[PDB]
Amino acid sequence: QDQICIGYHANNSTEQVDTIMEKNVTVTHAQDILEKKHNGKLCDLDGVKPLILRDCSVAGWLLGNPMCDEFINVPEWSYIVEKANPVNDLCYPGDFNDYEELKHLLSRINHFEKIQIIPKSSWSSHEASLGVSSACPYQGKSSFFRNVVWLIKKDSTYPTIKRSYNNTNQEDLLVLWGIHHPNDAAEQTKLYQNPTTYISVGTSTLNQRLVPRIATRSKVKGLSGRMEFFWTILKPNDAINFESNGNFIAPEYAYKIVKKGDSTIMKSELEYGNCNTKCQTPMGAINSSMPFHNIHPLTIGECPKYVKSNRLVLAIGLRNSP
Amino acid sequence: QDQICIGYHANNSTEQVDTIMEKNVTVTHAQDILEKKHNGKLCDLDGVKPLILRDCSVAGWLLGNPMCDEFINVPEWSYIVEKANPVNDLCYPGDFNDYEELKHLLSRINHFEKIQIIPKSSWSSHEASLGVSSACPYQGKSSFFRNVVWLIKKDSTYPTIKRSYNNTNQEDLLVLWGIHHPNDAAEQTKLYQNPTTYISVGTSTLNQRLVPRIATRSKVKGLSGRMEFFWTILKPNDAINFESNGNFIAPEYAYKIVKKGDSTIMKSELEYGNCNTKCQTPMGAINSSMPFHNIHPLTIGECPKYVKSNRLVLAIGLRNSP
Amino acid sequence: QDQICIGYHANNSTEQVDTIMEKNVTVTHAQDILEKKHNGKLCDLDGVKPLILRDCSVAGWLLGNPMCDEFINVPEWSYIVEKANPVNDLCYPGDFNDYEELKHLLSRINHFEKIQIIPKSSWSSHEASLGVSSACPYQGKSSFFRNVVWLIKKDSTYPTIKRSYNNTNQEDLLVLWGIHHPNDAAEQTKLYQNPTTYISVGTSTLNQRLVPRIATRSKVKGLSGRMEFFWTILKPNDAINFESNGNFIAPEYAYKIVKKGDSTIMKSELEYGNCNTKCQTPMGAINSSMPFHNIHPLTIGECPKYVKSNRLVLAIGLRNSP
Amino acid sequence: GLFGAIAGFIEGGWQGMVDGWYGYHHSNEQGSGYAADKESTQKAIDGVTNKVNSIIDKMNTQFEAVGREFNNLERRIENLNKKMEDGFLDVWTYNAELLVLMENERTLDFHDSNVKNLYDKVRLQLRDNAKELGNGCFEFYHKCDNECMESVRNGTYDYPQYSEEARLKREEISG
Amino acid sequence: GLFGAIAGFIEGGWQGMVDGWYGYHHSNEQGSGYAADKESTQKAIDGVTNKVNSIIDKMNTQFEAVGREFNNLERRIENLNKKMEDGFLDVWTYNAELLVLMENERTLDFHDSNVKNLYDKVRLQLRDNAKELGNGCFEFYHKCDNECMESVRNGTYDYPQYSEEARLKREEISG
Amino acid sequence: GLFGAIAGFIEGGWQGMVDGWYGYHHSNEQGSGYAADKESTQKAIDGVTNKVNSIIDKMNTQFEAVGREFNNLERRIENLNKKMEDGFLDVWTYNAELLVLMENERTLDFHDSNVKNLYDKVRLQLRDNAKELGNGCFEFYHKCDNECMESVRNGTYDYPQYSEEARLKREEISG
Numbered sequence A, B, C: 001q002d003q004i005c006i007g008y009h010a011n012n013s014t015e016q017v018d019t020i021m022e023k024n025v026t027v028t029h030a031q032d033i034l035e036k037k038h039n040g041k042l043c044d045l046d047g048v049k050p051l052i053l054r055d056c057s058v059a060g061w062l063l064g065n066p067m068c069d070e071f072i073n074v075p076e077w078s079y080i081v082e083k084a085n086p087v088n089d090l091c092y093p094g095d096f097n098d099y100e101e102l103k104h105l106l107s108r109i110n111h112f113e114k115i116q117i118i119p120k121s122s123w124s125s126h127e128a129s130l131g132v133s134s135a136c137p138y139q140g141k142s143s144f145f146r147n148v149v150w151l152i153k154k155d156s157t158y159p160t161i162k163r164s165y166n167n168t169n170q171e172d173l174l175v176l177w178g179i180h181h182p183n184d185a186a187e188q189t190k191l192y193q194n195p196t197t198y199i200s201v202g203t204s205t206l207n208q209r210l211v212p213r214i215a216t217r218s219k220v221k222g223l224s225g226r227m228e229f230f231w232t233i234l235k236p237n238d239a240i241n242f243e244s245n246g247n248f249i250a251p252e253y254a255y256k257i258v259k260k261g262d263s264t265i266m267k268s269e270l271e272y273g274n275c276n277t278k279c280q281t282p283m284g285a286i287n288s289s290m291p292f293h294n295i296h297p298l299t300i301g302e303c304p305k306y307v308k309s310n311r312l313v314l315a316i317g318l319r320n321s322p
Numbered sequence D, E, F: 001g002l003f004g005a006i007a008g009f010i011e012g013g014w015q016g017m018v019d020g021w022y023g024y025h026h027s028n029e030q031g032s033g034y035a036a037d038k039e040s041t042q043k044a045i046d047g048v049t050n051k052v053n054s055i056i057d058k059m060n061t062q063f064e065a066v067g068r069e070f071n072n073l074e075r076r077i078e079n080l081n082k083k084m085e086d087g088f089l090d091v092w093t094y095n096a097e098l099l100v101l102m103e104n105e106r107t108l109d110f111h112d113s114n115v116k117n118l119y120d121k122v123r124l125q126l127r128d129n130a131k132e133l134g135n136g137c138f139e140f141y142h143k144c145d146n147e148c149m150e151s152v153r154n155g156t157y158d159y160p161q162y163s164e165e166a167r168l169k170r171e172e173i174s175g
């Protein structure tokens, strides 16, 4: 006699799947919802290249740390890549004021341009040529940060500096300067003449007075003295006013800045790979369609949700028990 | 012949509904779970009016910015509404110390009472009425903050001021004061005899000594001078001690404060609407029954969960297939 | 006639369960997913005891507040328990710099060992035994913090102190010191001699210069003077260099520290209970197998997810209709 | 769908019925008409209304104030708050959307199940007193006046009262 | 519920049955009694236990310390922390509550389905050799000794073996 | 599972069928073979693909940057951020895992439901022109050529065209 039968598909699939009530259910077809794949590279973020600092910290890069790679015209970036512990930070040991907020500010920049603001050759009443250290060599000879000037007494006096720069540019600019904190009154007298000394800086926003701090300290890179750095954003058509009787680390170069967005500083040993994404990870970029991933927490961009699992498999086919 | 048939309801409904496996499913009845409605008004939060400073910053309001409100007496409020950029902040240019924390403190207040703590008529050894400026105009005439006093030398002396106030009230009070930072020694001398000057403020908790910073600065409202403000909370039965040989911006009025809760500062261009809610939004209030809303992230009160969707429709009826 | 019947289990169970569509459905068996039970005790975290300060704050304990119980040093702890308002904090009134960050640092410690770094018997040119106060009473007699030394002029001079300690240990050590703020210049001269005074502290990282601040203040424990404390972490093979003109509260004892993890400070009135857990609460420890709990928000350890419900009951059996 | 009823053996729903969600359509000697099965309809209404009330009421809402209180040298903390806000928004959006999808499916399937249970209720009452047309409809082997049909609805239908009538009435048709 | 069995055509469960969750009650000349269907009961137990254990074990728990470490001049940051904590409390509360509700409904319906499939297995075995009383019980048109019912449970019931006798008693009872 | 079909009255699936998920196996004079039910296979596929795409598309993803920007005197804020990150990971992990479990179960139950509804489609098409073997197979009481079986699959099977022949062979063998 003749017959018709209803039944269902079956195959060679070893693909398993879990269920609220059942485990290891072999199935016809399945799809992993968890993304686990990256390209192992650092890439542009949406067609905007990142700022890749090699052995330089942000400080060392902004200031002209001579042991750091020579400066590159890079007008635009989406995020900054630093290594975990850059070898070249401050050649002359010291500190950077409000450094993290500056790094955050600089994490993503729409326009950036190094600009000469006060020529080293215009400090006629002071020594602008001896402010040099073996800890900061340039071309084998002792030197110093390249965008900033360490002023010394000329002949045997340190006349009171009064100097100002007006931002005649059409963009905000980041201005950097510093104090030297010497070890003793002898060193103080030797470098400047003046024993009790100050540096005051004024802006439509800033009203600062820095006084160096003489103190006996441990040697760091053979030096016990310290350099302390400061910064501001000078508005267009605004001016900055420096006055100092000593210990002044004066500006020479500053930076035109345009900010339209924020990102962060990414810590990565990877290197650029001529690439574009919407999700960058320290281990590589992600071409992101999946709703979840398990690559790395510290991401920048439009990424899947980071999750702690090794597999998220959705059953699409049906039970397959051969 | 006889017949019985089992079937189900159907109608004229056009309401669609989505399903995990099917889209655009026409249905008998449905209920939106997403709230989208506001009243376009600023309202009380649980029967407590908000503090609505119209064109004044919190600073301009606390200190007596003459262009600000004839003192908006509000003994009690649930939140503070400021505009995005209030025209009236500090008439005399400068800064407010720990300002944001102060605004947060003042965001929600159970009792607030302005009280005279040091009468202007008690400055017998100093001129207490010339501390007036064109940057702080009232009615075309030069003036100053109304709750704070700009003390200037009388004749040609500024004797050392020693003053103390004991909080005999049963409530904490907010005390405000300031320093003037002049541009030059000439201005310093003209305003105050003494060239080297200080202001010490003492409390059972506070131990402050401020020194003016004379420095060349850019002009703000035509001025290069600066006003820097400071504040504390004086506990009952505690006293506050001011000592100064110059540059003192003294208290006259202070504020009784009782705090029982916290909120935040809301930025809105709107105006009061004689109204009550449990959920306020910068765009308007929410009469909240739904569990989700898409009005605005920056809300105050007991609000639905903010969500980025245009509709959350629950099927209650059944398929209505035409 | 003969009969076969299909049916299901039933019993006397009174356990109810709620359902998305039905409430108070009596059921055969059920399992509560919400944890509600604690042991009412303070316990170890992974077999590591907490540091339980009974009536001393972390400050009072670190500095040697004589009113604090002198107990057996605890080289290791997983978290710290303080009371909400400990009776013994700073015996001599004042402040502690970066105090919350220090408490956070000390919240979980792998090794802690008190160490003498500058013997009291080595201050031969100053009085190291008159630095004593009624606000810091020991055995009914006036005293001072025990790990720190209040140096006063001897006869009628205060020679400039220059002192250094080189960490010859293999561990970082926490070093503490302080400044004294007198009420007036008369007291300044009376205690020290020199009128204008400083304290400089130097490290491979620290560059500090403190100046006392004269201010008229309210009396706290009968005193208007103030003590201000400071700390650092001294790396192995680094040295700390103190120089002082007066007003120096010098170190005597410092602390070897090893940190490998972080926790926090817990506020609890409870007591140790010779007990271990992986989840501690201020109200007691939790034996955590359930995924949710409703005991207390402020937990330390591997805890269930805190939730605001009285009941999370899962149906395992079936409907039980009487 | 899941129970094979609504978009299955019952090809279509009834505009005619108004009294409820699920019901009966009869045609006998007295005429035709619709009548909604009240009990099961009420059960469905209570269940769905309870579902919605569960989606709404289990929501815990407490006072929160937000919130832009940081200055331009606190933008790291500002970003921390941004990540917090956006994170919570993503959580709530995804959960709400998916909740709506899953529960919409469950609701439709609930109606399906209800209808099937009704058809099977009737099935169990009549048995061989009627032919299952497979249409969701029953072709009666006997006379069923209105009062006969309400007992199908009442659930009080006596099968023996017609068992013989149907017998004769059946093999006469069994040509 | 969804499958119309447990609180549907079967009004009530059996205190008498103890050996399992789903089972049978027979009564013949040898007497009456219960016997629980071992297999489906164990399947159900493993499934519900796996459900609960999955709801518990999928929880990721890591070490956290909380946490009131901010002073009275850092109250904005404390507020950020508060918004975070309360946010998580809200998420976890809503999700836990609704999860318990939904999975409870699913569990009850799971029981319903199991019982119903049992009933249908028997139904398809007996066919017209017995009458569906609509209570969940079957009335045999023939004699069924212990071994025979023992074959009803086995799924090996011989329908042809009794078809003639059953037919006899059916058309005999049929007036 | 829930509807008792796939791993129930149909013990096993067909390696032979390749063109779809659910289908038919015929055997007549022209020979035997497999043929998949177009409609139900496509509907099941559309529903499942829609499920996966719903689980994927409802995710809100916005730009975020993270993020270790605090110094060694900002470790309380660092801890706060840690509690936030860990909280979100815990939420997304728990929800993703449970979503996958629950929705996988529903998917399998969906296949079960589909197959059962197919069996009922054929069953309702032929009725008493064929015998239900209870194996998921139908034994034709008549001649069914390829056009006839393709008309069973089509949902176009003509029952009157065979009612009498089947009637004859039924009253020949069904007793």
Ligand SMILES: *[C@@H]1O[C@H](CO)[C@@H](O[C@@H]2O[C@H](CO)[C@@H](O)[C@H](O)[C@H]2NC(C)=O)[C@H](O)[C@H]1NC(C)=O
Binding pocket: A166, A167, A168, A237, A238, A239, B218, B219
């Ligand atoms: C910085 O320099 C610019 C350009 O010299 C100044 O801008 C001018 O300001 C003067 C008043 O000093 C106005 O009368 C002009 O109209 C401005 N010129 C233009 C075209 O912008 C600016 O004032 C200076 N800023 C400071 C702080 O000195």
Ligand SMILES: *[C@@H]1O[C@H](CO)[C@@H](O[C@@H]2O[C@H](CO)[C@@H](O)[C@H](O)[C@H]2NC(C)=O)[C@H](O)[C@H]1NC(C)=O
Binding pocket: B166, B167, B237, B238, B239, C218, C219
């Ligand atoms: C503020 O004023 C009050 C009143 O003079 C002071 O409180 C009194 O102090 C004296 C001496 O200590 C006691 O005899 C009174 O009993 C106190 N009264 C109260 C209500 O406290 C208080 O000491 C003053 N504030 C300061 C900083 O000393």
Ligand SMILES: *[C@@H]1O[C@H](CO)[C@@H](O[C@@H]2O[C@H](CO)[C@@H](O)[C@H](O)[C@H]2NC(C)=O)[C@H](O)[C@H]1NC(C)=O
Binding pocket: A218, A219, C166, C167, C237, C238, C239
């Ligand atoms: C602290 O004392 C140690 C012990 O001498 C110093 O470390 C030594 O420095 C000398 C050179 O002056 C080396 O030859 C030794 O090998 C060093 N020992 C070690 C283990 O480093 C150290 O320089 C002192 N620290 C300071 C800042 O004074």
Ligand SMILES: CC(=O)N[C@H]1[C@H]([C@H](O)[C@H](O)CO)O[C@@](O)(C(=O)O)C[C@@H]1O
Binding pocket: A130, A131, A132, A133, A134, A135, A142, A152, A191, A223, A224, A225
């Ligand atoms: C401006 C100046 O004086 N530079 C000199 C410094 C400093 O005196 C101290 O080293 C600072 O700490 O010392 C040198 O030996 C050096 O480091 O190369 C020589 C150098 O010319």
Ligand SMILES: CC(=O)N[C@H]1[C@H]([C@H](O)[C@H](O)CO)O[C@@](O)(C(=O)O)C[C@@H]1O
Binding pocket: C130, C131, C132, C133, C134, C135, C142, C150, C152, C182, C183, C187, C191, C223, C225
């Ligand atoms: C080192 C020292 O001089 N201690 C003395 C102090 C100080 O004068 C003040 O405390 C400083 O402000 O005053 C005492 O009355 C006290 O507090 O018991 C006596 C004590 O011997």
Ligand SMILES: *[C@@H]1O[C@H](CO)[C@@H](O)[C@H](O)[C@H]1NC(C)=O
Binding pocket: A016, A024
């Ligand atoms: C379930 O499947 C996974 C994948 O192969 C395997 O690791 C695990 O041991 C399996 N469990 C059992 C009991 O089969």
Ligand SMILES: *[C@@H]1O[C@H](CO)[C@@H](O)[C@H](O)[C@H]1NC(C)=O
Binding pocket: B023, B024
């Ligand atoms: C669903 O319906 C909307 C109208 O509300 C229509 O615009 C849209 O194309 C439909 N979506 C799809 C393609 O399923």
Ligand SMILES: *[C@@H]1O[C@H](CO)[C@@H](O)[C@H](O)[C@H]1NC(C)=O
Binding pocket: C016, C023, C024
């Ligand atoms: C459910 O039971 C609890 C405890 O007996 C009771 O508080 C509540 O009123 C009940 N709910 C309903 C709807 O009866």
